[PDB]
């Protein structure tokens, strides 16, 4: 056993020398397409509340407004028919959630993590953490365990289950892959964030009209990212180098967004003040990751790229206009806010990936539209903003 | 120290990626500056046990099932355990105390404000012992297997302690018993990644949430409650710690997760409309002995050390799941009887408080080794293991140095 001096040795070996990068992105959806033209259509006749002819007028108004174009669902009206309890609203239904999510999340996470160590190109071998994000589902052992095994990781591969942090948690993930990949010398992190929201699929209701705008909102959908430092020259590409994480909770906000798992299954509650909420406090979330890092924070706000969170059209439109920017710079973002909705965790990386994507096709200086720093934000219950800073590599 | 304000750890003046990075990180090892301990108020001594969980549960007419638990609860060596309730508080809730009635949202409004609550209470004692300001707090790992919501556990912890608005947290739910395990773990690589980086660690328990009704076709459900206690146990964790102001006690230096194949349906719990639904099997002892010295050998070698020839040569704080699997940890890895006395002290005054237990373990540990005016916090050894078993089945494996007292 070595001596009391030879543990700084140990450190010193153990950890990497690099920033945590990301070098790979897969996606996934599930089957079930769902026009958000004939959305008030198919929900009001699933839920059987034809009846409420004002409500329905009402949220058909919210569907267009939207700007999201089609969401994809594990389920269609003939699987909703099966469960009558999901398609009410206050009849007990998480056993039957729980049932569909539990196994179903790890699953829709596993095919976009396939896409992402497929796109990587090495061995699953080499994949020594997991972070596992969801809000849909709880379960012991949790939804890592069952993603690890499905892929067939390593038995000693370090998990780590990020259960319901919400809208943040595609930030939040990029926070923990960060301090995994760079204190461990060759560490590999894959990260996978997948949500099956039939956990908060309800009937609509007058006095909680705010519950069904998040039905109109979620869709379902996996994002996945291989993140490591020290990026193997020839073998790895290299694309966003994840420099500073930051969690910042508004105070006074709490009553904002709130989500409570119960006997009901998941019950949305959303004030109408939320993207005033997150567009005020933004910028000041911005300031403070450069600063954390001492880079002077542009005085133009179009000089970065940007992964925003598509948590509504709303909060990107007030986004947008607190830091001045011109319409193309949420362009990525608007792009699968429309494509596939707003995914929770999973929109993020479907953002940065569709950012790299369009930027390679383009033949763009660097991943991040040519620009150099850009920011990845993660906007949720508390209120709580994850700003995460990215430096973008060149092609 | 961190050395936040030195030259050789500023950042650069411009925007130079590995610069930034060299800066940011810390030097040293992640390690346990502080531990603070909290538990509920209601005392339920294992011997009346048997008698006072019968009798909340309109079960004392199941007389061979009592008999059989009585005799499960005289084998447990568990002396007492605290909870957040008593008789009188148990009435208010018949679904709770029924076997399969609705129940969640009662567990979930019990639990999703007194987990943070019992967590904050021992976050305070750690914060009190660490001895600096709240604010220099910049990590906060909370961690419970009783009752979710969002915002989450963690935002609740940081909200009643008045931590600062931008403090990063991270919320470990529903790991388990090996959640104890898991949270030094992440403390590990939040606190050696980030220079002047406090991490406090907090696990909590309230385990109403996993009570009910014993069941004549579900014995091992009654058997996890009769080794399920309250509890709360926080640590401050930091890298370079502060020569004259912080207490350095343990060096977390290296930190596997190891899933054992082929054991899921071994430990089960399932969050149903009835709460907190537990399945366990009678094998679990065994299979944890069995695979515990592959977990250790890994942990060892990984970070270059030959694993010791003797397992007695390390100090240990293994996770007191049942009184069996230390038993049998004990004898596969030829431990004396005395290797586990500071888990077995733990098990007896306050049960299994599932993630709690190990923070409680470290606790007794550093403290009778400081009373008896031992060589270090670690039993006077250098090395030892901190050990989380539970559901997968999943071994936290956590290699320890100890400091000289
Ligand atoms: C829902 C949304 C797409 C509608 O677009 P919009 O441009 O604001 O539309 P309108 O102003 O015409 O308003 C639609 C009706 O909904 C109302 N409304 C919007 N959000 C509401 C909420 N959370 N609760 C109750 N009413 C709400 C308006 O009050 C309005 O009705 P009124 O005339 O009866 O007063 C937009 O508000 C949005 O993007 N919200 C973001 C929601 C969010 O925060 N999602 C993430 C949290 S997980
Ligand atoms: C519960 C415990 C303290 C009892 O000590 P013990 O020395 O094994 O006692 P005994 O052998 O006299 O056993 C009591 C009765 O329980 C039974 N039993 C033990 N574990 C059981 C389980 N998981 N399910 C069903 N029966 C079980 C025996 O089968 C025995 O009865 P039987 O002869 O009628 O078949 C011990 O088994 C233990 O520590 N188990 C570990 C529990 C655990 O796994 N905790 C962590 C999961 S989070």
Redesign the pocket.
Known sequence: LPLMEDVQGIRKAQKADGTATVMAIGTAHPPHIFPQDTYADVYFRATNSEHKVELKK?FD??CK???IGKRYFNYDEEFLKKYPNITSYDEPSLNDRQDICVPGVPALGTEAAVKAIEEWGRPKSEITHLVFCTSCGVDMPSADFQCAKLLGLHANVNKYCIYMQ??YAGGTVMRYAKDLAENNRGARVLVVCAELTIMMLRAPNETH??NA??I??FGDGAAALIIGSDPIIGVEKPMFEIVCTKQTVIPNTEDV?HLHLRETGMM?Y???G??MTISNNVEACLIDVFKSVGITPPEDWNSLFWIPHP?????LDQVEAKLKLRPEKFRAARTVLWDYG?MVSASVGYILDEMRRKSAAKGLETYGEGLEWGVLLG??PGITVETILLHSLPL
């Open positions: 009402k108004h919210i407004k939207t700007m919400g809208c009209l705010d705008i998040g109109s909102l967004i949305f959303l004030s109408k939320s993207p948590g509504g059209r709303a909060i707003n906007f949720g």
